[PDB]
């Protein structure tokens, strides 16, 4: 009879996980401030990690990795990729990014080389305080809009789905358990734009923007969400290739690269408490079938059809592995 607490009510993922635990008849939910727990479905902001692992006779487990924010923040991800030799500034799968509050003169250094060199000189400015994003070809407009933000090279040549001539992004859910096994959920989603890509709403593939500002919401696929079965079939019929070969090999590479990079800093291998965490990786694919990492989400949601399968898998390999009772993942070995 294990005990667990719930400190994030708005977690749609762990509301279902907490729902499944009670259904097993072997997990008892306690008050959110009771410290005599085995599992903490903690809060996003200011989780008191310093108070975990000090309860005698209690193996304690939390659903967040302390320090994983270095990967799940815009400016932190940029600094982590430029400064870590495991990733290097020669990183081939991350768009050329810069942090502006600093790297103002460094950003304008590569901006002049693109303007003079007749190359595509379109960038994008975003930050972690957004739903506020600007896409422009003039650097003067990007810097005035900021007045912490990040500016990275806007992928001007994206892979467009047909029929529709429309943009998309791929969301991969990755679960990292207490042993730091990297489990990639076999089911992904393509959050597609319902408007044709005009290089002169159709640029931002967010699920909230396509339902509020787009008029073709739900025309091609239900909820502007195309799952892997349909997308792989399209890659075979249109490009004569598979999702595994053209895209998913690079995805698994990036997930391993990022997570193995921060492993010494966040591992709870010999720590007095254990951690797991569900991650949301956002990828962009260009017309050359090259995968690009956009951002990593630390508190991700899920597709409605996949809430059942994934949340059950969170209990199987992350919760019941530490607290046994009485595969949908691809193990990225390392």
């Amino acid at each position: 009879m294990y005990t667990f607490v719930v400190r994030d009510e708005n977690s749609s993922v762990y509301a279902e996980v907490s729902r499944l635990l009670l259904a097993t008849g072997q997990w008892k939910r306690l008050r959110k401030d009771n410290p005599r727990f085995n599992l903490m479905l903690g809060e996003r902001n200011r989780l008191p990690f310093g108070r975990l692992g000090h309860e005698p006779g209690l193996v304690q487990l939390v659903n967040y990795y302390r320090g994983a924010d270095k990967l799940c923040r815009k400016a932190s991800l940029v600094k982590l990729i430029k400064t870590s030799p495991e990733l290097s500034e020669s990183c081939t799968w991350f768009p050329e990014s810069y942090v502006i509050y600093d790297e103002r003169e460094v950003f304008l250094a590569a901006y002049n080389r693109r303007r003079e060199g007749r190359e595509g000189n379109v960038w994008i400015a975003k930050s972690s305080a957004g739903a506020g994003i600007l896409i422009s070809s003039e650097a003067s407009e990007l810097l005035d809009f900021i007045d912490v933000h990040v500016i990275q090279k806007y992928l001007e040549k994206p892979l467009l789905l047909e029929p529709g001539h429309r943009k998309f992004d791929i969301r991969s859910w990755v679960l990292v358990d207490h042993l730091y096994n990297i489990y990639l959920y076999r089911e992904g989603v393509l959050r597609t734009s319902s408007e044709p890509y005009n290089s002169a709403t159709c640029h931002l593939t967010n699920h909230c923007i396509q339902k509020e500002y787009s008029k073709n919401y739900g025309r091609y696929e239900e909820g502007n969400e195309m799952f892997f079965e349909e997308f792989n079939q399209y890659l075979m019929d249109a490009l004569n290739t598979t999702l595994e070969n053209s895209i998913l090999l690079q995805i698994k590479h990036i997930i391993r690269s990022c997570l193995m990079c921060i492993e010494p800093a966040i591992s709870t291998k010999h720590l007095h408490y254990q951690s797991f965490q569900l991650f949301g990786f956002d990828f962009m694919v260009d017309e050359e079938l090259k995968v690009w990492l956009i951002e990593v989400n630390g508190a991700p949601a899920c597709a409605q059809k996949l809430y059942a399968e994934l949340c059950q898998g969170i209990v199987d390999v992350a919760i019941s592995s530490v607290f046994p009772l009485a595969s949908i993942f691809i193990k990225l070995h390392h």
Binding site: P56, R66, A265, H270
Partner: protein
């Protein structure tokens, strides 16, 4: 040569002090009767061990120590113990009734009645000193005497010995061995009124010693004797530079100079390795690289915390055994390229290293195995603030309902001292977060 006076207050301070001076005598070759055959200067001298031992004309080497307890049963153990012949009765001070786990009872009620007697006995040891460095104060956080009378003694020592340094060895409360519910109160009350009077304090969390004893020594349910023999080893590693020839941490001032740049942030984290069970007939001797790498494992720290999520302000490596500087630097280079060791911007990223060739001494028949080399790391990490957060939280839980407060007010303490002390801890906890992030 400059002398150091050790002061042991409460049950925890006296028993830990009892285990330390036993280890000191084994290390310096002093027999229980006080004799020391290797000391050729009979009746005097200014050797390194004379900073902790005075000498009588008869050749006895007497510890420069004072034992204080508001209850006679613990100090009566010293009076009839194995090393009873070391101390003279002037150094042992006992009362009738203890502080009953009440900070206010040990600071105000009972402390006021005994503070002049203790200071007078301390003055007797100071008069035998030709150049007193300062004091080492051993006490618990949770006990009424260890918290209440210590904070009064630290106040009065700053008055009577203002130019002298004061170091603490403090036992942080852990429910697995604690004997009182109100220990969070006593810990924060005593940290508040002692903060401005202590130059460098070494916290030992009983939780850490307990698990190190269970995990590494295979003791199913460790006792105080188990815990104190391990603590005295760490204490010996820290005070060895005061008792032996050397150049690192040669006086009490150097502890503050090398470990404490900010006066309030004077709680260095101690990490010790290796801890090997003596029941293992043949254990593989760990290397310099292996014991130095173990200095960055939380499981070997005296306070459980994660230094990865914090910043360093200083770092000292104290080696005892078969260690040469070449192997130390080889280990540090490897550790730099593997561990998360972030220093603050206003401090050099480096290590002060001290090596003493004499390998560690273990009490014959004890639980610790003799090893060829060992290391104690003293690092000033902001991550040790986690121990304050735990303490302060338990405080806030009980104080919100004013639970047990009447026991303290009944001793003449005002309720405002509770929130005044808690506000100080909130300030201290905020200083750590500024330095750490």
């Amino acid at each position: 040569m400059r002398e150091c006076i050790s002061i042991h207050v409460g049950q925890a301070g006296v028993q830990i002090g009892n285990a330390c001076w036993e280890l000191y005598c084994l290390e310096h070759g002093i027999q229980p009767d006080g004799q020391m055959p290797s000391d050729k200067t009979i009746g005097g001298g200014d050797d390194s061990f004379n900073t902790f031992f005075s000498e009588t004309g008869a050749g006895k080497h007497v510890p420069r120590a004072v034992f204080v307890d508001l209850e006679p049963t613990v100090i009566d153990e010293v009076r009839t113990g194995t090393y009873r012949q070391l101390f003279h009765p002037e150094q042992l001070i006992t009362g009738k009734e203890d502080a009953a786990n009440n900070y206010a009872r040990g600071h105000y009620t009972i402390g006021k009645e005994i503070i002049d007697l203790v200071l007078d006995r301390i003055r007797k040891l100071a008069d035998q000193c030709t150049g007193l460095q300062g004091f080492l104060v051993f006490h618990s956080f949770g006990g009424g005497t260890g918290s209440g009378f210590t904070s009064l003694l630290m106040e009065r020592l700053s008055v009577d010995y203002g130019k002298k340094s004061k170091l603490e060895f403090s036992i942080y409360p852990a429910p697995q061995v604690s004997t009182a519910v109100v220990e969070p109160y006593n810990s924060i009350l005593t940290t508040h009124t002692t903060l401005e009077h202590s130059d460098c304090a070494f916290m030992v969390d009983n939780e850490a010693i307990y698990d190190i004893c269970r995990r590494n020594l295979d003791i199913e349910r460790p006792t105080y004797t188990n815990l104190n023999r391990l603590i005295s080893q760490i204490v010996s590693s820290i005070t060895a530079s005061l008792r032996f020839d050397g150049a690192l941490n040669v006086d009490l001032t150097e502890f503050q100079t090398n470990l404490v740049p900010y006066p309030r942030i004077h709680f260095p984290l101690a990490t010790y390795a290796p801890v090997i069970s003596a029941e293992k007939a043949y254990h593989e001797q760990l290397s310099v690289a292996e014991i130095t790498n173990a200095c960055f494992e939380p499981a070997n720290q005296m306070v459980k915390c994660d230094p990865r999520h914090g910043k360093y302000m200083a770092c000292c490596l104290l080696y005892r055994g078969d260690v040469v500087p070449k192997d130390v630097n080889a280990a540090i280079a490897t550790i730099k390229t593997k561990r998360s060791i972030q220093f603050v911007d206003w401090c050099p990223t480096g290590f002060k290293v001290g090596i003493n060739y004499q390998p560690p001494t273990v009490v014959p028949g004890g639980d610790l195995a003799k090893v060829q080399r060992a290391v104690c790391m003293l690092s000033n990490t902001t991550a040790i603030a986690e121990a304050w957060a735990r303490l302060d939280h338990k405080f806030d839980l009980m104080y919100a309902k004013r639970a047990f407060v009447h026991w303290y007010v009944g001793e003449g303490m005002e309720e405002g001292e509770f929130s005044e002390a808690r506000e100080d801890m909130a300030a201290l906890e905020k200083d750590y977060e500024e330095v750490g992030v």
